[PDB]
Amino acid sequence: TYIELINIVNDDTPEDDAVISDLMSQMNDKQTVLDSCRINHKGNAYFKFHVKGSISKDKLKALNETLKDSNLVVTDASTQRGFMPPNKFDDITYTEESVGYRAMVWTSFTIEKL
Amino acid sequence: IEGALSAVMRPTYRYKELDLEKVIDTIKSKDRWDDVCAAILNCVKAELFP
Amino acid sequence: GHQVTREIAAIPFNLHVNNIPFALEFKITGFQKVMGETQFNGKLADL
């Protein structure tokens, strides 16, 4: 029925703690960090990570407080509804490498030095 | 709301954030300038006509 | 109380009034990301 169908989507979508856990895994994986590395206009370096699910404002603040211990903050976290492009791309255009479905919930994190 | 015309039209406001990093495919696109122009105008047109 | 000055001051007397409660507001960012490339200025260092 209708309620079950929307529960499937909202149950497939991971919750805040799972989103943070997956973000930490991507930050620990060396190749993913390299793929997410971006050089800013000042010669600085920021990292962009694509993580399935969404994080609420209350736990994003908790995430930033956790990251401060590492001199990192999340300057942006945008909740997209669409396909997840690989971390080596900056754009959300659908390619043969994209994972997901057209209404998938996922977040694009921008992590910068404190 | 303030403004004399509020009495003869339906007050209308729309806010949309456009991130060129996510829209523009900088790796493969041959003409980045045109893609930026299209992204901005497509954002405006999509919201303005309705 | 100790120095006299010829103070020729201009006092703006005007008002900006909005007539039509209609606007579409867009926030467009990322131009420097998609219209330019940063040069390899040596290695990445935190200073």
Side-chain angles (χ1 to χ4, degrees):
Chain A
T1 188
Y2 178 80
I3 298 299
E4 291 175 353
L5 291 168
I6 64 172
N7 288 340
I8 291 167
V9 173
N10 289 333
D11 292 337
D12 187 76
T13 302
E15 76 278 13
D16 288 11
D17 289 344
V19 171
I20 291 168
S21 180
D22 286 345
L23 180 62
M24 297 302 102
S25 180
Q26 290 179 2
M27 291 177 71
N28 289 335
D29 184 82
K30 180 65 175 178
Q31 186 63 51
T32 303
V33 171
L34 293 169
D35 289 347
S36 295
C37 182
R38 302 291 185 276
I39 299 169
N40 202 355
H41 64 282
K42 293 185 170 73
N44 293 330
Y46 65 92
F47 296 92
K48 182 173 72 69
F49 294 93
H50 298 168
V51 179
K52 186 177 177 180
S54 64
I55 184 166
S56 67
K57 70 180 177 65
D58 291 345
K59 298 297 289 292
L60 182 59
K61 289 179 180 179
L63 176 59
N64 286 336
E65 290 296 321
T66 299
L67 291 170
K68 285 179 180 178
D69 286 344
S70 297
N71 297 310
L72 298 171
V73 298
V74 179
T75 60
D76 191 24
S78 175
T79 300
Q80 295 293 306
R81 299 297 304 275
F83 289 95
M84 180 182 289
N87 285 305
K88 70 184 181 183
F89 292 93
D90 294 315
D91 66 272
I92 61 170
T93 300
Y94 180 76
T95 67
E96 66 275 18
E97 295 179 22
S98 295
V99 61
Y101 58 93
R102 70 183 182 179
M104 185 179 73
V105 178
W106 63 280
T107 301
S108 176
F109 289 93
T110 301
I111 299 170
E112 298 184 53
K113 298 292 181 66
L114 185 67
Chain B
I1 192 165
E2 299 179 55
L5 274 294
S6 65
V8 297
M9 62 81 71
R10 298 175 182 179
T12 301
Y13 179 78
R14 304 181 70 83
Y15 176 76
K16 181 74 176 178
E17 296 183 352
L18 174 65
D19 185 348
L20 294 171
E21 183 177 359
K22 291 183 175 67
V23 175
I24 307 301
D25 181 334
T26 61
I27 294 166
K28 301 298 184 182
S29 176
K30 183 175 180 180
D31 183 329
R32 291 178 180 174
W33 180 86
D34 187 56
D35 288 345
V36 171
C37 290
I40 294 167
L41 291 171
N42 288 338
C43 182
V44 172
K45 287 190 288 186
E47 298 298 322
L48 182 60
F49 284 123
Chain C
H2 298 289
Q3 175 72 52
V4 62
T5 301
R6 184 175 179 180
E7 293 186 358
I8 304 169
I11 304 164
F13 189 6
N14 57 62
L15 172 67
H16 296 88
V17 177
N18 295 278
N19 296 314
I20 300 172
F22 183 105
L24 278 78
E25 181 178 333
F26 302 91
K27 182 180 178 180
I28 304 167
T29 65
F31 286 97
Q32 69 273 33
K33 290 180 180 178
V34 300
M35 296 299 291
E37 297 284 348
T38 301
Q39 300 299 306
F40 183 77
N41 294 325
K43 295 181 180 179
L44 299 170
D46 291 315
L47 302 172

